[PDB]
A paper describes a structure:
The bacteriophage ϕ29, a representative of bacteriophages with a short non-contractile tail, has an ~19 kb dsDNA genome encoding ~20 proteins. Both 5ʹ ends of the genome are covalently connected to the terminal protein gene product 3 (gp3). ϕ29 infects the Gram-positive Bacillus subtilis cells by injecting the genome–gp3 complex into the host-cell cytoplasm using a short non-contractile tail, leaving the genome emptied virion on the cell surface. Here, we report the cryo-electron microscopy (cryo-EM) structural studies of the ϕ29 prohead, the mature and the genome-emptied virions at near-atomic resolutions up to 3.2 Å. Our results show structural details of the complex capsid, the DNA packaging motor and the entire tail machinery, and provide a molecular basis for understanding the assembly, maturation and infection mechanisms of the bacteriophage ϕ29.
Each of the head fibers is a homotrimer of gp8.516,19, which consists of a pseudo-hexagonal base and a protruding stem with a unique three-stranded helix-turn-helix supercoil structure. We also determined the crystal structure of the N-terminal pseudo-hexagonal base (gp8.5 N-base, residues 1–116) to a resolution of 1.8 Å by molecular replacement using the EM map as a search model. The crystal structure shows a similar homotrimer with a β-strand missing from each gp8.5-N-βA domain of the trimer. The results showed that the N-terminal 110 residues of gp8.5 form two small β-barrel domains (gp8.5-N-βA and N-βB) connected by a short linker (residues 58–61). The two small β-barrel domains are similar to each other. The monomers in the trimer are associated with each other through hydrophobic interactions and have large buried surfaces in between them. The head fibers at the quasi-3-fold positions can further stabilize the capsid.
Author numbering:
A (entry chain A): 1 to 119
B (entry chain E), C (entry chain C): 1 to 118
The structure:
């Protein structure tokens, strides 16, 4: 159950980083989601600025994202720098919670959820 | 692993049209979502009025629907006629935005507002 | 994609009951969701208090859950007692709506939704 569309990278996109969709010229542009925002989707490949890319979207349950800092199992997560995922406690910016442990730079597996886990 | 349910078409349903769920006697019913309403899902096959179907619903951030008129990238979309997707200027009726161009009758891909990301 | 992780039961958990997740000591802890709360998932097997268990979470838009009382198609559902699903009128507590009927104690199928049907 995959749905695909073509996009243009408006800035360099690295694999396993959170993505924002934006209005380009006759095309959707993708870029790393901004810090402390709710992402639109997640990248699974690296795209160079200005290149076309096929964005394949899958049913939502869990995402694999690079950790922007140390993440503990059960942390609530928001967007960090460069489209990474980082812990937060601001409920209005949470988009998921970690179910694996990850040091900064490692791939974290998170469950998509706009509600925080009770700590 | 998928959790399915039986549904009955309240009226004739066409593949890749927007659907609304409604209560029936011992059956959830499906029909094309009404003009300018927020849809519940999208049909995968034709279902004649009165016939049953197994709904295999996925939580998606993007849908593919038949365009009811010409659509430009980024247009905000609501339900048109016969369960199609069309642009609108009324924010309270929008359920997603187009991520590609489509002419009337062409499949259009769109990104949903009311997903697990809302 | 689905995810599989190892959790610890904070309390006794029964098959097809609503679950709440909480943060434990570098592990997710599970227990029956509390009455009138929004659950995080549903158990597929009994788990004794203190035991580790393998949770497999799939991309599902519908769940199967034990009914806490008689449920009719279209009922908006919240968490009842002992992790069961019951009808409710409080919009703040709804987590889905029934798409099949179920007597108390049987399995009901529901579509996940923070909004009431219609």
């Amino acid at each position: 159950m995959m749905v695909s569309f073509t996009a243009r990278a408006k800035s360099n996109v690295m694999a396993y980083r959170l993505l924002a969709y934006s209005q380009g010229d006759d095309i959707i542009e993708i870029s790393h989601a901004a810090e402390n925002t709710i992402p639109d989707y997640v990248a699974v490949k690296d795209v160079d600025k200005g290149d076309l890319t096929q964005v394949n979207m899958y049913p939502l349950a869990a995402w694999q994202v690079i950790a922007g800092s140390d993440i503990k199992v059960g942390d609530n997560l928001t967007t960090g720098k460069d489209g990474t995922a980082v812990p937060t406690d601001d409920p209005s910016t949470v988009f998921g919670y970690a179910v694996e442990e990850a040091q900064e730079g490692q791939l974290v597996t998170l469950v998509i959820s706009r509600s925080k886990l009770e700590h």
